[PDB]
Every structure is written in structure tokens, then in C-alpha cells.
Amino acid sequence: VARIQLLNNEFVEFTLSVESTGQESLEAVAQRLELREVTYFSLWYYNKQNQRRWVDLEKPLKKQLDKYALEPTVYFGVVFYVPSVSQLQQEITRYQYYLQLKKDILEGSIPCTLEQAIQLAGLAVQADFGDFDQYESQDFLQKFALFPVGWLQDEKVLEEATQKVALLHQKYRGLTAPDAEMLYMQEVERMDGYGEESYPAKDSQGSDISIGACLEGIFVKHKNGRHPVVFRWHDIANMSHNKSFFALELANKEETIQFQTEDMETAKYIWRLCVARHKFYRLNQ
Amino acid sequence: SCLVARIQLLNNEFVEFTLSVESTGQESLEAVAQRLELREVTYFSLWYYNKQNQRRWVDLEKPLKKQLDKYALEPTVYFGVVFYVPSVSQLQQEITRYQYYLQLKKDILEGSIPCTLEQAIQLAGLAVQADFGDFDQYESQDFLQKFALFPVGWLQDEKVLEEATQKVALLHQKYRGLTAPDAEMLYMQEVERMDGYGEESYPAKDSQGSDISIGACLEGIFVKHKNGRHPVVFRWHDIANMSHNKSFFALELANKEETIQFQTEDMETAKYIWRLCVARHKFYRLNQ
């Protein structure tokens, strides 16, 4: 009854029961991939406004899609990001993680400079194509584009960037795909934006902010940029949602912090992901 | 040679009947289906309270008198659902659905599927419409006062119970025209989504000597802890075999040396848990 886009961008049709949960569908994908470390992963969909929303894994999936999704398609992905990918035990887990981190770079959720894009491309081509070959390299320049279509609009810049990636590819001769993938993920893990999911909100004064979860806790960014704040997981005594508001209680403060979101439903969703991430980093730390 | 037995039907009616030495469990169950004109009998069976006051489903292919004699506190059996479907929309006959509805309403009212005040009101509204029909067929709605509408154990607040009862009467008025099979199907579709629905668990002890509750669900074998450590499910696809050696019910996990062992109080109990989990595995396999 279902369509899932995997991290390799392949669409698979999955025939599951009527009232089967999001967890059940997640487990069937994992079984297909022979993925054993499923806890890092989940499924998301485009809602009726085409905003991405992770599924509620403990509820029937059909009814979630019937009610909130424009189309009955879900997407496999990483919901819980680790501080160090060496914590991932099996190669299949690491490969799936690697595909997700590449998508985060391609989609700009983890911004990168041109230099960073070049260095990452160098490891990725070794991971994805094996050892450099002078003939396959020139063929590649015709088959595919190395950088996303809008990143380098300047012909000479694109050419020098591409040649630099080629030189790095040659320097990585002999790296196995799992090793190249690990080096790639070890660089992406130290990049700003890694493991962050943000949402618009307003603070108690009416100012526009970005709030979200990061490796270290709940963060608040003001348009200032002058002072970003993180409430570390260990310091958060409680979290709640009520109508459009998402709220934090800190252990060291009898003053709770309130964030106004767009929706009652958005507040509930943000609260749910923040609670799940708090639980994860409690276990993982 | 003869046992004066007793059966409580799902409408809480009691029916006495004598039991021969050769009367088997499938036989007595078959008679109950005849009395109800019930054709989809496979979901249903008979259980009794054993001498330790736990529910035991009868061995259908073994003589019934002997079972009640060695194990039952009294010669009373209870008609009930042994195999809970995940969607009651699969039940085909109106008789089948109605018997399922009686069972699900008993599950709610006895408290075995926990519910909130608001759910209990919503459910009672549909049940009243199903059981009594349109409110304006009655000179007075005073019958609401004479039948138990909600689960017992948590509604000692008399004022809250008053308003709950008034809200059930209002819902009943709003449900005028809802036919009995429709209200019953709504009732069941609401119950089937509730935590605890279809969940049956049996006492054992995990290898750490803690006292757990073990059962079979669509996803696999689940282990509950009364203290509340962490409910766990072993997925069927990960269970290579299940066993009842001596007083132990055990899972031979696939891909692993791991054998998850559970101590039961009886060699009889380990065999019963095994039979019931195997039977439920067959039932879920029969449903895609």
C-alpha cells in the first residue's frame, strides 16, 4: 500500500497491513536493507504545506498519511545524529548514515564553503567510484556534473574546482569505500549545522528566533546572531507544549522559557521530537 | 463420570449443563457456537480460572471434565475471544461482530483495556445507542441509571460521575438514528486502537529473577515488567524457535547464540505459554 524513497533515491513499494505502525514500516525497510541498528533512523513525509515531518513511529502510519500528507510517500532517513560515527557498529549502518550526510550537504542543511565542497567531493568520489582512472575521470566530465546544478555558475571556477577534486581523487588511491566513507563522515560531523534541526518561533518578547535540537541540547538563535544560547540536555528538567507554545524548564531556574510556534500542531510536533532527542542523548551520552 | 458445569456467555448470562467424561473442549465450544448461531468460531474459545486464579484457555482437543477437575477452582468456563483481529473490519458476519462487541465492551468495563474518563464517556454513548436504540423510544431515559456505564476502580468522584452520566445521555441523544451494527462497529474501532487491546500476558520470571509478563503480539513476543523497567518486543523474524523445556519457556534468537529464558512456576505453565504463543503466531501468520 506504501511508497518509500530510500537514501539511495530509489523508490520501493512496500505492502504492509492497514493499521500497521510507523515503527512496523521502519522495521520492514531495515529488514530489506539488512540494517540492524535501526534506532538512528526513521521516516518522514511532506505534510499538506510540503513541510517535512518525521512520522510518529508509535502510531498507525496510513492514518498519519491520509490526514497530514499530500501524497502517501515516506522517506528513509537519520532522525538521531551521533556525535561520533565510530559509534556506528556495522558497515551497513555506516553506509546508510553516509548517504544521509551526503544528502544533508547536497540539500544545504549543512552549509559548506567551496573549499569544503571540494575536499568532501574528493573523498566521496573515492568512496563512490573506487580508484581514480584517467579515462573514467574524463568520461565522468560528460556523463554527470560533480557539483549541484546551482552551486558554481562560473565556468572557470567550476573547471578549477573540478580539477582540484580530480587531483584529490588520485591522492586517495587505495582507500576502500568503507574507509573513504568514514573519513567523509568524520569531516561532516565537525561542520556547523551537523545534527541540527531548527524551526521558526518567537521568544517571550515577540522577537523572531530559531529554536531546535542539537548534539548538546536545545538551542535558540536570535536574528542578532550576537548571542546564541544552548540549554544543555543535563540542565533541562522538563519540556512541554500547550496550544502554540513549546516550553522548557531548567534545573537551575524557577523561570520557565516559553517559545511561541506557528501552530498547536507544530508546538506538539516540536515538543515530540525534542523529547525523543532528549531521551536519545540521555541513553547515548 | 458427570460434572455439573457452568458457562458464562458474553452477555454475562450463566448457563448450566452437565459434562460427560468424553466431552472435549472443541465439543463444548462447538455447542456454544450452535446456541449463538455463530459461524466464525475460530476467534473464540473457553477459559477458566485455574487453582492459582489465573485465566487458562482450555485445551480444545482434550476432554473438558478432566481439565476443570485438575486445574479449575470451580466448574465454570467463560466464552471469550482468544484471537483478537487487528481490524474488526475483517469479521464477516453480523453475529460475529456482535459477539466481538460484547467481548470488547467487557474488556473496557472490567478495566483490562485502560481508558480515560473522556474515552469511557464516548464509548458508553455508542454502547447505549447500540444496546437501547434511539433515546426517544423511551418514556424516560432513567434506564441509564440502572446499568454500569463505565469501568470501576477510578471513578469514586460522585460529582464527576454525575456529569459523565449526563454527557453519556447527551451523546446518546446526538446518536439518534445510528443503527446498532454501526454503533457497535464504531465502538470496536475505537477500542481496537487503544493500548492494551488484544494483549494477553502470562507470569514468568526473567533470568535476572525479576517477575515479568510474557505474551504474543502481531510484532512478536512481548515482555512486560509490573515495576515498569521497559516493555520489550522480540520480533517474530528474530525468533528462530520457541521452547518449553522443563519449567522454562525460552526464545532461541536467530542470528545469535542468545537464548532468552523465562522461568515459569510449572512445567504445565511453560507448556501452556508455548502453546498459546504458537497458536497466536499461527493466527497472525494467517493474517498476512
Residue numbers in the entry:
A (entry chain A): 24 to 308
B (entry chain B): 21 to 308
Quote the study's own text.
However, many of PTPN21’s biological functions require its catalytic activity. Combined with biochemical analysis, we have found that PTPN21 PTP is weakly active and is autoinhibited by association with its FERM domain.
The two molecules are quite similar and adopt the three-lobed cloverleaf architecture (F1, F2, and F3) characteristic of the archetypical FERM domains found in radixin, moesin, and focal adhesion kinase. The F1 lobe (21 to 106) exhibits a ubiquitin-like fold and is composed of a five-stranded β sheet covered by two α helices. The F3 lobe (219 to 308) consists of an antiparallel seven-stranded β sandwich with a C-terminal α helix (α8) in between, similar to the pleckstrin homology superfold. The F2 and F3 lobes both interact with F1, and this arrangement holds the three subdomains together.
